[PDB]
Nucleic acid binder design. Structure first.
Lengths: 86, 127, 205, 80, 123, 82
RNA sequence: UUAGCUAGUAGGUGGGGUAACGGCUCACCUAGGCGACGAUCCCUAGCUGGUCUGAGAGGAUGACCAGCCACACUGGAACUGAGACACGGUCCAGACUCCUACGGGAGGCAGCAGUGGGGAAUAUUGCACAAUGGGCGCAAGCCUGAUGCAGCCAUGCCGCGUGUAUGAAGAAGGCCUUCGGGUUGUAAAGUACUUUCAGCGGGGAGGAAGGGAGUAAAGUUAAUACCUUUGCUCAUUGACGUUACCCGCAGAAGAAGCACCGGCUAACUCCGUGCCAGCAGCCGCGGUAAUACGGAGGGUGCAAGCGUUAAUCGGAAUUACUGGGCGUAAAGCGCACGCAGGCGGUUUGUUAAGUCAGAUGUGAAAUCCCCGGGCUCAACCUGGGAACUGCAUCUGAUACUGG
């Protein structure tokens, strides 16, 4: 970049990018564990997995990695499905 | 290529003076044009030297175009007559390539590069 | 921006006295008043309808010292204004400062009055106005400023003025060299061999 | 506050949808003649109770599909 | 005639075709002199009228009049042309601007000088 | 945010300001929300020169609109005048 | 002189997805969806407020000002962030250019100046953050080619000047003349007189609000601290700037050109030329008297401009809705049947879409118009109004049209 701060911003945005990426990848992992339990038909594994997932979709919302509404749908959606089976 | 340069206090006062020098240089330009054509005092050339070659020259530097042309008129002969048309201050241009389009001529420069709009014309027609 | 050439030519072409000289002299002893200027002045113009309209407009313009652009703009304003356009044109002309200065007798001619104005010799309401076309309003007081008061042109100008018909709508004190534009002149105040409607016709076609 | 449209059913083929045509007269902007103009609307018909040719009362609602932003309020006249 | 008919096919004004297309809505154009010659005019006139063929900066090539008495123009003369037909010369739809670029003013003109590119004579 | 400020109209050497409520990001003479006064710094002061709809100014402040240094002055000046 | 178009296509279910509704996406299911009220395809184009023209209805148009959109070397992409798929950020690919010690690097003026190029043609590589406004900061302040200003160009609009008055047998010169005289022409010279503007000296508003030290009072608080608000005094802040404006000095002194004069069209004669040279918006001028060519004298129209060219509308009722035509002038298909379409006799009831009424909201500001205000006037700036003839919702009226 040409301007002093523009240079600095590219550096900061890359750091943030690697920070966000790391936390975001983690989060989707814990979401995916729940969908995987559901697809195997286990209430407990899927409830257990939902309980681990809950606090982290909530936290990443508070931290701006995602919006509150996204966290809610995930909880709403998974909760809907797990109940529909056991 | 060279001359006396003088600074002035205001530009507006120096505008009329600069335009005045153009008028004299233009008046003598048309004057020397009328003489050379009327000098023959006949509707054509008395003999068969009528065949001639035309050239088009644009040099990057102003000092050369006046200087080398004098040397370019030294190689001139009675049999074949060569004349310069539209000596340029630099580079090349649309109206210059057009100048060589009307009358067949070689387009040469002491130092020049082809413009983006210049390449299109030169590549299209045969030059 | 001003007509600077011979003046009696203009009177001679329009067929009338245009008051472009002081009036000290019978105009016929200064020029061949009843003959147009030029080689073919004796010739008569078998004059078209357009011709009579043109010459009438020229006449008025030449009386007041107005060139075409400003005069056309005067027509436009007369037209925009309420009431008869032809009469509105003459109100606007007659309200000009160079004109009013002339009518109070401060200048022997409108040309002389205009010079008085331009040369910062005239005040309006004790305020210096030096542009000829300044529109003067009811109750305004125009005066020769103190320093211009001893100019002999002005005394002579007031003498001649005293010998012209005296305009109704102006109150002039010759001693003070101040005067008051009481009201806009009516149509009836102004000469009756001006044909405004011809000028109005010229500018509507 | 119940803004509404009235029109007739030109197609009832789709599952839970219908095509409704709203026709009106309009003064011609230049030549003054009163001209028929038609507006076709894809409308929601949950339960598919609307038959072709029916005259139906419809209302505007949120997007229901790429082309449906209207739903059925009620049938007015049917089976002419 | 019918309202119905106009409602199906609106009134459609004819588009004006130009008399100086080579100008392409420019006030003048520049061009090189291709041929410089004379030509005779149409009934009932008779003369040797000066015209030139001119290739314009936009590619168009047109014939243009060289008004005035006398001119010093030849091939490769760069001139300025303006609109303006020559009536008894069919095909001729432009005039050359005397006293611009390579075109000189008319010699010795005193009246209407500005239409012939002639400076005001010291006097 | 929303701000109350002077949009400079009038002519060269003869400034004339239009007091306006607007999104602070829009250009000075550009999009505004509401016009609310004017300010002539060149008024003869024989008659008027500064006029403010103080009721609507306050309404906008009540909803968090900020106020120019120059409008904040005008308001104190006009409040003093009457 | 394009008639058919469409497989995420149209809809349904469910999962996923977004900040959010949604074929946004995926699977499955239904077979739809668009189209002669012009789809599809092709050409062109940023839209508006408004601008120009026109009595109007229209026609033409979308610089400058303001609103919306889109773009940022070309094609694609997402990252950061409340906001971007980023005008002076990132990544990939392309086109191109610059640096290099040859191994490798760097950049994107459709920001402001400026350059080359193209063109008939469009400006200075300027001053200042003093004012308004933006970013950051508690502030002081720093940054701001936004902006305020200055330079260039008669490009346009408006204003003013380039003098005023007097001046006759009315000179000389020029021009015409039947040689009597007419004209240029009160024009010039002479005589007084004025001094705007330009020149030169002298003085000198306003655009300045604030901010800074102190001080005092209130709200604070344990507190007279600090903080903040509001009064007081002191010293200060203007790029423009040699500002606007006012006074003084010198002398008419430094300031007039352009087109036209045959009819349309205001303005006429002589000499030169001789179907030549040439003019020409249209008619049409030129072969021996040419007011039409070219010069002259005279005149007409404009005037710091005047002409020519280009360009929109007007006049053009010459695309005719307002507002035309088709026997012989351009125009009735060679004739008939007929789908779509347009139109449809008469009565009642109903409906209330068309139509009509009222109410309400909206129709940005600027512009236009009206009455005022401010710059010496005007252009210009500005207060208030009126206007935006339009759209939409509700409630009515039911004669006419439609159901």
């Amino acid at each position: 970049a040409n301007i002093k701060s523009a240079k600095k911003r590219a550096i900061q945005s890359e750091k943030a990018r690697k920070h966000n990426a790391s936390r975001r990848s983690m989060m989707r992992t814990f979401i995916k564990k729940v969908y995987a339990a559901i697809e195997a038909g286990d209430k407990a594994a899927a409830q257990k997995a939902f309980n681990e997932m809950q606090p982290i979709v909530d936290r990443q919302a508070a931290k701006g990695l995602i919006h509150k509404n996204k966290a809610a749908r995930h909880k709403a959606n998974l909760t809907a499905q797990i109940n529909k089976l056991a | 290529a060279g001359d006396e340069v003088t600074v002035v206090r205001d530009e507006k006062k120096a505008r009329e003076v600069a335009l005045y020098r153009q008028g004299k240089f233009r008046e003598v330009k048309l004057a020397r044009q009328q003489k050379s054509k009327l000098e023959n005092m006949f509707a054509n050339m008395t003999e068969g030297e009528v065949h001639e070659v035309n050239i088009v020259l644009k040099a990057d530097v102003q000092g050369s175009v006046e200087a080398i042309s004098d040397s370019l008129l030294k190689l001139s002969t009675d049999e074949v007559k060569v004349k310069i048309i539209g000596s340029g201050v630099g580079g090349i241009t649309e109206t210059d390539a057009t100048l060589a389009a009307a009358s067949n001529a070689i387009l040469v420069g002491f130092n020049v590069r082809a413009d983006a709009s210049a390449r299109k014309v030169i590549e299209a027609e045969s030059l | 921006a001003r007509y600077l050439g011979p003046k009696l030519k203009l009177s001679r072409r329009e067929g009338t006295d245009l008051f472009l000289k002081s009036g000290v002299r019978a105009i016929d002893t200064k020029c061949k008043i009843e003959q147009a200027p030029g080689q073919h002045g004796a010739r008569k113009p078998r004059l078209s309808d357009y011709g009579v309209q043109l010459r009438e407009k020229q006449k008025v313009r030449r009386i007041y010292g107005v060139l075409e652009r400003q005069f056309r703009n005067y027509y436009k304003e007369a037209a925009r204004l309420k009431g008869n356009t032809g009469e509105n044109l003459l109100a606007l002309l007659e309200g000009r400062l160079d004109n009013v200065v002339y009518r109070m007798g401060f200048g022997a001619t409108r040309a002389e009055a205009r010079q008085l104005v331009s040369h910062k010799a005239i005040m309006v309401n004790g305020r210096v106005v030096n542009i000829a076309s300044y529109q003067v309003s009811p109750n305004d007081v125009v005066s020769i400023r103190e320093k211009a008061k001893k100019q002999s042109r002005v005394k002579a100008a007031l003498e001649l003025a005293e010998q012209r018909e005296k305009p109704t709508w102006l109150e002039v004190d010759a001693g003070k060299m101040e005067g008051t534009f009481k009201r806009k002149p009516e149509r009836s105040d102004l000469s009756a061999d001006i044909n405004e409607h011809l000028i109005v016709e010229l500018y509507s076609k | 506050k119940i803004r509404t449209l009235q029109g007739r059913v030109v197609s009832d083929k789709m599952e839970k949808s219908i095509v409704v045509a709203i026709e009106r007269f309009v003064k011609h902007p230049i030549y003054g003649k009163f001209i028929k103009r038609t507006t076709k609307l894809h409308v929601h018909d949950e339960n598919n109770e609307c038959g072709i040719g029916d005259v139906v009362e419809i209302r505007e609602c949120r997007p229901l599909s790429k082309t449906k932003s209207w739903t059925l309020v009620r049938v007015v006249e049917k089976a002419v | 005639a019918t309202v119905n008919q106009l409602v199906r096919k609106p009134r459609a004004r004819k588009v004006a075709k130009s008399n100086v297309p080579a100008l392409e809505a420019c006030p003048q154009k520049r061009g090189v002199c291709t041929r410089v010659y004379t030509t005779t005019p149409k009934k009932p006139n008779s003369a040797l009228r000066k015209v030139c063929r001119v290739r314009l900066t936009n590619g168009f090539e047109v014939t243009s009049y060289i008004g005035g008495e006398g001119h010093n123009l030849q091939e490769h003369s760069v001139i300025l042309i303006r609109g303006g037909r020559v009536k008894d010369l069919p095909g001729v739809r432009y005039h050359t601007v005397r006293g611009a670029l390579d075109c000189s003013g008319v010699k010795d003109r005193k009246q209407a000088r500005s239409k012939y590119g002639v400076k005001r004579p010291k006097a | 945010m929303v701000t109350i400020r002077l949009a400079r109209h009038g002519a060269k050497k003869r400034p004339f300001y239009q007091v306006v409520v607007a999104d602070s990001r829009n250009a000075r003479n550009g999009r505004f929300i509401e016009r609310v006064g004017f300010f002539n710094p060149i008024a003869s002061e024989k008659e008027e020169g500064t006029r403010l709809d103080l009721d609507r100014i306050a309404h906008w402040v009540g909803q968090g609109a900020t106020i120019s240094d120059r409008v904040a002055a005008l308001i104190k000046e006009v409040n003093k005048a009457a």
